[PDB]
């Protein structure tokens, strides 16, 4: 179905929490708790960060990342920003038509 919508870019100074949002219809983000986030560095494969709205993978993801959902909007919060943190982030959801759709991605820059 139609894509998830994200802000094009977000920036935050090192050490301060920042939030990225992704909006979806009542059929994807709104209806299910199936939301995941991926972090991608240039020239590399995307890495899973959040799954099931707030869950984190057992290894490789710091506790500084947290997912959340309200209404039709899901959000990724990064706190204690670091240089490694700057990367491309993608929202992804399981839609009503049993297909997987992702966001456009947001580029985050740390000052």
């Amino acid at each position: 179905q139609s894509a998830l919508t994200q802000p094009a870019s977000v920036s935050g100074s090192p050490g301060q929490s920042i939030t990225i949002s992704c909006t979806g219809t009542s059929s994807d983000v709104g209806a299910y708790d199936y939301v995941s986030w991926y972090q991608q560095h240039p020239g590399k494969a995307p890495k899973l960060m959040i799954y099931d709205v707030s869950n984190r993978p057992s290894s490789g993801v710091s506790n500084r990342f947290s997912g959340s959902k309200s209404g039709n909007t899901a959000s990724l919060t990064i706190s204690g920003l670091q240089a490694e943190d700057e990367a491309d982030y993608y929202c992804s959801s399981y839609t009503s038509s049993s297909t997987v759709i992702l966001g456009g991605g947001t580029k985050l820059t740390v000052l």
Binding site: Q1, S36, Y38, P46, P57, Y94, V100
Partner: protein
Amino acid sequence: QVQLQESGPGLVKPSVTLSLTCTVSGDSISTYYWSWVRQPPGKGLEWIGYIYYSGNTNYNPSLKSRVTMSVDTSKNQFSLKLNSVTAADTAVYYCARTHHDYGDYRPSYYFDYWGQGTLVTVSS
């Protein structure tokens, strides 16, 4: 220690079907779903579709008319076929495992392992 590796052509002429395989090493295809995701340069990720070990498949509706996937459990690898490749098709193609717990009816939507990726160029 699942490790995905895919192989294929670098350059492909238009109107020619594109074939790509991905080999799972260190673990087997097992009971998981296996997806293909393509990223055009400087563009967002797009989910092409996935296949399951029994051949059951699901695809992206936009690409559904021209996409065929196949799994081969003996050789422990799965592949992708794309018809009528054009300018739009140029992308880095990743083969990512999609998490699935066998036996419960829970949709499998997210990718917990990824291949290195392969760059495919559609040009004359």
